[PDB]
């Protein structure tokens, strides 16, 4: 039904919360256990906007190299992307440039949102100060939390405005 | 390839794309499981597809897969590598889609390698393609040189930077920077010379109106500054002037302007001395960030939209947000020395503009620069307030909010000096923004800024402003918007510490406003907390006017569908501190949830190797490795267990006998099992402190007590030998002490006394050993002293027998911390004439200790000599009476803080000897003793001295004063009889002689003296 739909590739280090983030959108439930994704899982997410139903086909990829292997082949014909990292794990932020690099290898120019997940957790290792890759690459950045729903929709809303090219789009 | 192979692979690669998980999973198994035996065929295929397939999806995927699988090329037969190379290259030079040529180039790059054979046909293909009339050929060749910069090892790049295709230019620049990225510095000066051609190419992008492509070039240039800032030295002014020009041209789209800003910003992070040696940088940087910070509320002069929204940031204000963090970043790197001047040159101007956006911008710019420039601005502080505070009343609410922001920010950044010197200007300013005349956003932000200020302000400074603060915040409390209610409750709770007394005044209007908010988990909790803090502040009787309502909302809140839950518990607890035993009927509502949590088991489970690598993503769990295995505890759950126990313990403490109902269950299911929580010492400690408190709860209510105590003591004692943490061992002795004190006389049995001795010895032994390796140790031994002593007393000496078996250990200690220990033990021994067996083993060392240069050793020593005379009068006279002269000397910096304690025990020690052997002494002595009064610091000593003073009854004014001093210094107490003896002496003197003695004393101690005599 929705006639406006986009391939969205969701990448980032293992355990940063990518699947939890998507499941939360899909069903509203929060999954507590970590069950690594194998390769990719494709989930359609439909947003009801003031410009109609917008569908993001979310390609939830595997962050653990051992389950990835061919991840890069999922990038093909993606129209937008989310790079996720974990605000409580400095290493995930340190890998952001590698994720970014690989995505643009395939998807030349395409809107990308950088998300720092798990801001619901007390001891932040990646402080707002640290986070500046978005400035060096013109990416949109957001703090998010799959657990508390903080800025839950911001990444999709931003991408929607960008891809429809209408700043008045509202969810 | 065989034609069969092709259609199987082609199907798989096509299916590799379904968004559909089945079609694509089937192809996934097929690739991974069916396709060392087949890999060369597969690589040869995917290279063929990418090169020759007419289908775009297939061609792209194959090129991408080929590159990916190649890194998973060196182990491939050379005949096949060559064929792969040749087809990739034929593909490249044929007719292909742009994005496919890009992906071919990516795949080609995976075929060039240090260990791989030379491929001079590639080199030749690149040079030709760079001269092709097709941009995509040119662009794609640079892309290859980017990925494999070694192929590079001048007119090519200069033609590149100048190319009519933007795409080619961006790729030229990308390749140019990639060289520095990948090669060592020794190679850098070889392309370095090209930087001016590159920089000189830049104005052309603005002429053609190609600012998106400019942004990409700025991205590359940003990377280059972070690698080789010095390369830019000669043209630094030129790049500064160029970025300035871009940013000011505000018909350009944001990306060229935001990336230009980032280019500017990044010089401060990578060459601070370069920036500092050039006044142009500072001036340009401040100017451009100021201009961008005015780009707010565009096409909305009233700020209607901003006034109507919540107190979060508007993410549409991109350039503004970028400019804020840029100015902050540069200021932090360069300092105020360098930036204050250029900063202020501009602020002075913009504070006075007729455009509101510029008055705002000025506030936000100061806000951004303040921390980094603190080294200078912490002194130009009146000047800053002279600019800022006038704007607090700007006709425009966003300029107002802006001014609040600065006052908030600098209250933090220039603290505590700003609190001392500008409270008189800052507080009234912020407080005036609280009135409901102002807009919601401004009231809220001013209220926030009062928190920054209060954080580092003394209660004395805040005091005259509190009623004003409070009356205004109550009005904020009545707003219909939650972000104001919440911020108001944050401030009232921040101020509740000071206003502990000024609530009674505001109570009757505040408390119902609070109850209405409760009738936003964060809101409700903060509201609860204000409510119960106000209730404590105004005391129980006034709290009763709404206690029943508050209670019933709390009860409903706890039983409704975790930040809040920690507020309910703290509040329930504060209500208990108000209500006293009137809380009793609430227990069955409040306690059971606490019991559930406090009964969590330690949950240790086997994690699997590999699963341990990822457990790093459960932060409530912790993992340890034991042998070849890993085990995990749910640590968070056990922290919560401690939390619950801390609450149950403070319930038991407050409610005394009233808590008895819970004692057995809490004792047996919570306190005692907690002693076995081997992975978690918080638990173990909480378990131990609970024990004596539970017993004293059951005692106050009423064999059960005895059973529980026998169980609890034995688990405590058992813990002593096994416990790894000496901090915990100290808790267990403390807990035994406190238990013995609750339970009384002869509360331990013989096995217990033996098991205790072993424990003590294993603890003494390890303390010795830790210290023959080098407060923690002093304190433990302090407690072991207490438990030995506590145990001695309940046995009434009988523990003397056990005490021996460990006498060698004690004796080693005797011959400073180990010494003090031992001396203190021996004093306790004597207190309970059956120690003769040991007299000979210690008095030589005790008598030595008497004259020790260490006060603490003398103290413990003289105490021993004094206790000898008191409890073992006759088995010790050959010692006490000789040493007596030594004591008269130790007695004489004696009356000085450091050794006041030691000389007071000696004093009491001689008073003890004088008592035991009353007229069997060779009497000067008692007059010596007397000159050692008053006893004002050691309480047990003072207790004996004034008893002895009272047995005995020129030196009357000194007799009286001796007692006045002890009472007033609170060393003998509870002002509870030597006074009776003194009043009799004063009885035998006239009205006027009696009076005159107190003539020296000031009013306050004469008030007390009247109530003493
Ligand atoms: N506290 C907190 N936990 C989170 C949040 N997001 C995810 N988690 C937890 O983090 C763990 C990892 O989540 P996943 O979503 O499976 O991680 P993933 O990024 O999909 O990992 P891969 O599939 O291996 O690439 C799970 O235990 C989640 O419950 C969050 O925002 N806050
Ligand atoms: Mg996943």
PDB file of C-alpha atoms and ligand atoms in Angstrom, chain A residues 18-19 36-37 60-61, ligand 2:
ATOM      1  CA  UNK A  18      20.183  -1.815  16.394  1.00  0.00           C
ATOM      2  CA  UNK A  19      17.723  -4.696  16.593  1.00  0.00           C
ATOM      3  CA  UNK A  36      23.234 -11.243  17.666  1.00  0.00           C
ATOM      4  CA  UNK A  37      21.751 -10.712  14.253  1.00  0.00           C
ATOM      5  CA  UNK A  60      18.975  -4.477  10.336  1.00  0.00           C
ATOM      6  CA  UNK A  61      22.571  -5.743   9.718  1.00  0.00           C
TER       7      UNK A  61
HETATM    8 MG1  LIG C   2      20.976  -6.900  15.462  1.00  0.00          MG
END
